[PDB]
Amino acid sequence: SKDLKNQLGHLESELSFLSTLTGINIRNHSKQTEDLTSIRKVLQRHRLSGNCHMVTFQLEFQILEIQNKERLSSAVTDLNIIMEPTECSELSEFVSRAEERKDLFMFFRSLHFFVEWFEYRKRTFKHLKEKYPDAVYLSEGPSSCSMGIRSASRPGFELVIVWRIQIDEDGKVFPKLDLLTKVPQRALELDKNRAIETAPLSFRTLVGLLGIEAALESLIKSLC
Amino acid sequence: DEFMMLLSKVEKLSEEIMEIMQNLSSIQALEGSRELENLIGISCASHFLKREMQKTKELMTKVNKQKLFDSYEFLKAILN
Amino acid sequence: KKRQRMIEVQDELLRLEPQLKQLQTKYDELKERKSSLRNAAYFLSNLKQLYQDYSDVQAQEPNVKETYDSSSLPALLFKARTLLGAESHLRNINHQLEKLLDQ
Amino acid sequence: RALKNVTVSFRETEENAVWIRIAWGTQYTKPNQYKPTYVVYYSQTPYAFTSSSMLRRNTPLLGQALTIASKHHQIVKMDLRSRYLDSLKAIVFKQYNQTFETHN
Amino acid sequence: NEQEALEEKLENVKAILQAYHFTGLSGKLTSRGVCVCISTAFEGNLLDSYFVDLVIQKPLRIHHHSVPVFIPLEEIAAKYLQTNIQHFLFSLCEYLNAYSGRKYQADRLQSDFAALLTGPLQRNPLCNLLSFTYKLDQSFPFCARLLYKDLTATLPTDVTVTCQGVEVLSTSWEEQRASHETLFCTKPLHQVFASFTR
Amino acid sequence: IDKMVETTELMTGNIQSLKNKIQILASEVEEEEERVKQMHQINLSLPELSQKTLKAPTLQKEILALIPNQNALLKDLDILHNSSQMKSMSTFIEEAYKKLDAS
C-alpha cells in the first residue's frame, strides 16, 4: 500500500504543478449523462467550480455529442456561469456576452488576461504609493480604478489619473490611461503660457515615450 | 469606543443625506441614459441606502463582540 | 552572355531593396522620437513652472474659498463617484464580512 | 522575359500544394518536351521540392523565379536528396514522430 | 478500509484532471518534461486539438509538436519562450483558435450554400484572404474580397464588394452593396448568408 | 538590362543619401535627449501600451462632449463637496478600506 501512497503523492504534485503553471485552480467536478438515441445521440451535463487568483467562479453547462458513422460532432448547446457579486460590472457584461456566444475557451482566456492586467494595476499603485507616502492620495484603494496626486500643504491644486480595463466585443483586453485636472481658476489667470489645456495629448505622448511608471515618477517629481 | 459614536451620529445624519440628494434636480437628471453611467462604472442609484446602511451596523457589532479583527527559475521553483 | 548579366543585375536589385526598406523605416521613428521628446520636455517644464508660481499665492491668501470652472468639473464629478458609489462600496464590504462569519 | 520560348503548366493540388511542369527553351530553340522539370511548392511555407533532371543549366533562374513569385529575399539548397518524396516531406516538416503522452 | 479511501482519492484526482481538460489547455509530466495540449473551438463547436512537447533543462527546447508549419511558431517561440512561458502558451492558443475559426467559417459556407455561389471561392492555407462571386435570387451579380490583416481575429479588417456584369441602374443596388460591406466586416461569414437568404 | 541598371543606380544613390541623412539625425537626437535627461531620471518592467490605447479618443473630450448646460449643474456639486457630511462619510469609507487592506 506504500506504493499506492507514492502514486497519490505523485498525482498531487503533478496537479499542483499544472494548476500553478496555467493559473487555473479547478475544484470538484460532477458529470451527469442521459442517453437520448434515435446514428447515436448522447447528451451530457457538466458542473465544475474553481478560481483564478483573486477571481472565483462556478459554471454549469451541457454538450450534445451527435455520434455518427464518420464524425463525432459535439456542440455546447447550453452554458451557464455565475459570478460572485463584485462591483466589476464590465466583467459581468462580458460574462453576459460570452454566455450568449456559448464559448468556453474564450471566456477563460479573457478572464486570465483581465485578472493579469488587474494585478499589474494593483501592484503598480501599491508600489508607487509606498515609494512616496507624501505625494499620493489613494482615495478609493489599490485594487480600484483611479489615483490622486496632491500636495499635503495645499489641497487647491490636484490632478487625477484614471486607469481602466476594457473588454472588447471580439474578446481581447486592452487598458487605457487618461487624466483630469482639478485646477482653480486663479492658476489659470495666473500663467499666460497655459499649456495645461493640452495636458491629455501631451501626457499620452509622454507615457508612450518611455513607459508608465517613468512618466508618473517624472510628473510627481515635477509637482513636488 | 470612538468607532461606535461616529456610526451613531451618521445614522441620525443619514436622513439629511437623502434629502439633499432628492432636493437637487440635477442628481435625478443623471439617470435616464446609460451612456454616462458606463463611465461611472455601473450606474447612479441611491434608493435603498437606508436599508443597506442599517444592516452594516449589527454585523459590525458582531465583528466587534466576536473579535473578527525568468521562466526556468519559475518552472523549477514549483516542480520541487 | 547578356542573359547572365540580366540574372546578376536582378540579384543585385533583389538584395538592395531590403536595405532601403529598413533604413527609411528607422529614420521614420527616429524623427518622431526627437519631436515627441522635445514636446514632452517643453510640457513638463511649463507645468513645473506653473505649479511653482502657484505655490506662493495660496500661501499669501490661505483663507480664500477657491472655486473651480468647467475644466475641473470632470475631476469634481469623478471625486463625487465615492459619494454615489458608497452603496456599492457598502455591499462589497458586507459581502467580504460574512465571508469571515462563514469561516 | 529571361528566356523566350518556355512552356509552364500548373495543377492546383489538394492539401495546399502546387505542381508545376516546365519545358526549357531559349530564344533560338523550341522547348524540349522530353526533359521537363517538376517542382512542388507548398504555399505559405518556405519549402519547395524540385526534380533534378536538367535544372543544372538554369538553376539560378528558377531560384529567382521562385523567390520573386512568393515574395522572399533569399534562397538556399538543402543538402538532402531522396527518391521518396513523402519521406522527404515528413523529415522536412519534422512530423515523423506523432506520439504524445496525454491522460484522456 | 484504507484501500477504499485510497481508491476514492485516485478516482477523485483522475476525474479532476479530465475535467481540467475543459479549460482549453492541459499538460502531463513526462521524463523529459511537459507535453501540452491546445484545444480549439468556434461558436461552441469543438474542433481539432494540437500538442507541443517541451524540454525543461536550460535552455528550454521543443522536442516535437503537431502545430502546422504555416502558423508562425518560430517567431513566438523565439520571442516568448525563454521568459514568461505561460504568456507564450496563451499567445499560441490565440493564434490557433483564430485559424480554426476562420477555416470553419469558410468550409461551412462551401458545404452549405453551394446554390448561391457561381464558382468555387479562392482561399489560402492560412485562411486570411477570401474572394468569391455570389448571386442571390432579382439577380444581383456581386464579387467580394475579404482581407484578415490580423491573424488573432476571425473577422476581416478590409472588405470590398463591387457590382460586375452590369452598370448600376438603381440606388437599390448601391444600398445593397453598402449593406453587404457593413455586414461582412461586422458579422460572421456564414451567418450573413443565411440572414439575407431568408 | 539597361532599364534595370538605371533603376539600381538610382536606388543605390538614394540609399547612400538616406544613409548619411540618418547618420546626421542619429547624431542630432543625442544631445537633445541628454539635455532632457538633466532634470529627469534615466529610468516592474511593464510592457508598453499599444498604439490603440495612445490614439484612442481622450477621456476629457468625450466627458465635455456628452454633457449639455454644465454651469448650473456644476454649481450645486460644489456645495455638495462643501458639505461636511460628505467628507465625513468618505473618510469613514476610506478608513474602513484601510481596515481591510492591512489584514
Task: Write the secondary structure of A64-91 as one string of H (helix), E (strand) and C (coil).
Answer: EEEECCCCEEEEEEEEEEEECCCCCHHH
Alpha carbon distance E159, E181 (integer Å):
6
Contact E55, E35 (CB under 8 A): no
Residue of B nearest to E55 (CA): B72
Alpha carbon distance E154, A170 (integer Å):
9
- Largest Cα span, chain B: 65
Alpha carbon distance B52, B55 (integer Å):
5
Alpha carbon distance A172, A114 (integer Å):
9
Helix (H, G, I), strand (E, B) or coil at E119: coil
| Backbone CA torsion sign across B27, A141, F62, A217 | positive
Shortest distance between the Cα of B48 and any Cα of chain F, in A, equals: 17
State how far Cα E56 lies from the chain centre.
29
DSSP bridge pairs for A31: A46
Which subunits count as partners of chain E given 3+ CB pairs below 8 Å?
A, B, D
Q: Which amino acid is at B46?
A: S
DSSP bridge pairs for C68: A184
Alpha carbon distance A198, A216 (integer Å):
17
Pairing of strands A158-167, A173-182: antiparallel
Residues in chain C, total: 103
Residues in chain F, total: 103
Q: Does an H or E element contain D8, and which?
A: strand D7-13
Contact F46, E84 (CB under 8 A): no
A38 CB-side CA count, 13 A:
7
Alpha carbon distance F15, F10 (integer Å):
9
State how far Cα E143 lies from the chain centre.
24
B50 touches chain C (CB under 8 A): no
| Backbone CA torsion sign across E162, E168, E172, E174 | positive
Q: Residue written as cell 522547348? A: D31
Per-residue HEC secondary structure of B13-78 comes to HHHHHHHHHHHCHHHHHHCCCHHHHHHHCCCCCCCCHHHHHHHHHHHHHHHHHHCCCCHHHHHHHH
Burial class (CB in 10 A: 0-12, 13-18, 19+), E66: middle
CB contact under 8 A, E24 and A103: no
| Chain A residues touching C36 at Cβ < 8 A | 205, 208-209
- B/e letters for C30-43, b = 16+ CB within 10 Å, e = fewer, are eeeebebbebbbeb
Q: Residue written as cell 473651480? A: C68
Q: Which cell is A2 given?
A: 506504500
Q: Residue written as cell 450645486? A: F76
Cis previous bond, E59, omega within 30: yes
Q: Which amino acid is at E130?
A: L
Burial class (CB in 10 A: 0-12, 13-18, 19+), A100: exposed
Which subunits count as partners of chain B given 3+ CB pairs below 8 Å?
A, C, E, F
| Chain B residues touching C90 at Cβ < 8 A | 52-53, 56
Neighbours of F41 (CB within 10 A): 9
- For A164, residues 6+ apart whose C-beta sits below 8 A from its C-beta are A145, A175, A176
Contact D2, D61 (CB under 8 A): yes
DSSP bridge pairs for E25: E38
* Residue to substitute from D26, D62, D64, interface C, most C β-carbons within 10 A: D64
CB contact under 8 A, C100 and B63: yes
Side by side, which strands form the sheet with A158-167?
A: A146-150, A158-167, A173-182
Contact C20, C13 (CB under 8 A): no
Q: Which cell is E78 given?
A: 523565439
Helix (H, G, I), strand (E, B) or coil at A162: strand
Per-residue HEC secondary structure of F23-87 comes to HHHHHHHHHHHHHHCCCCCCCCCCCCCCHHHHCCCCHHHHHHHHCCCHHHHHHHHHHHHHCHHHH
Alpha carbon distance A188, A190 (integer Å):
5
Side by side, which strands form the sheet with E140-147?
A: E129-136, E140-147, E158-163
| Chain B residues touching F67 at Cβ < 8 A | 36
* Residue to substitute from C2, C6, C10, interface D, most D β-carbons within 10 A: C10
Alpha carbon distance A157, E107 (integer Å):
61
Neighbours of B14 (CB within 10 A): 15
| Chain B residues touching C100 at Cβ < 8 A | 63, 68
Contact A48, A29 (CB under 8 A): yes
Shortest distance between the Cα of C40 and any Cα of chain B, in A, equals: 28
DSSP bridge pairs for A181: A159
Neighbours of E39 (CB within 10 A): 21
E149 CB-side CA count, 13 A:
4
Alpha carbon distance B25, C48 (integer Å):
40
- B/e letters for C46-82, b = 16+ CB within 10 Å, e = fewer, are bbbebbeebeeebeeeeeeeeebeebbbbbbbbbbbb
State how far Cα E174 lies from the chain centre.
32
Q: Does an H or E element contain A55, and which?
A: strand A55-67
How was this model experimentally determined? cryo-EM
